Amino acid sequence: SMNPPPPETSNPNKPKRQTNQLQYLLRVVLKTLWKHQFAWPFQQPVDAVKLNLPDYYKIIKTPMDMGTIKKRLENNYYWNAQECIQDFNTMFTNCYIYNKPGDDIVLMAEALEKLFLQKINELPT
Numbered sequence: 001s002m003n004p005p006p007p008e009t010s011n012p013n014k015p016k017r018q019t020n021q022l023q024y025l026l027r028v029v030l031k032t033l034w035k036h037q038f039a040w041p042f043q044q045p046v047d048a049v050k051l052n053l054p055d056y057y058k059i060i061k062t063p064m065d066m067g068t069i070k071k072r073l074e075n076n077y078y079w080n081a082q083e084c085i086q087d088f089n090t091m092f093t094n095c096y097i098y099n100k101p102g103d104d105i106v107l108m109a110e111a112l113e114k115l116f117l118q119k120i121n122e123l124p125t
């Protein structure tokens with residue numbers, strides 16, 4: 001269909017290894033964004049079938065969403081915090097390059113992104 005398979009969320013052949021930055025990404029960054037009143041469009045992959053968005057996956061090269069990021073963090077999928085930060089950035093980029101600038105979805109992305117960037121400015125060493 002219009003929708004790709006969702007990104008992989010677990011890695012069965014990697015060690016379990018935390019870093020205090022990965023702990024912060026889950027317990028501070030993701031948890032704060034997840035509970036935000038504007039999170040809901042970003043809590044799962046964009047369902048281009050159900051939302052009737054035939055151009056979405058033509059335009060977006062790297063699908064990403066916070067449900068995938070949440071599962072990745074819970075499964076210790078990321079080897080390092082920069083991989084996770086990259087996924088958040090991708091998610092926001094996708095929204096900004098696809099959607100019309102004055103739309104609610106973009107207003108919502110911006111509020112989430114400000115919060116994200118403020119928490120990343122406080123990323124522990």
Ligand SMILES: Cn1cc(-c2ccccc2OCC2CC2)c2nn(CC3CCN(S(C)(=O)=O)CC3)cc2c1=O
Pocket residue numbers: 040041042046047051053094095098099103104105106108
């Ligand atoms: C990340 N994302 C999520 C949703 C969405 C995924 C699941 C459920 C709802 C979703 O978007 C709802 C819109 C209200 C925020 C979505 N939907 N669309 C298509 C339209 C919907 C209507 N908006 S608008 C005029 O309201 O800003 C423009 C984009 C693009 C989307 C996107 O980039």
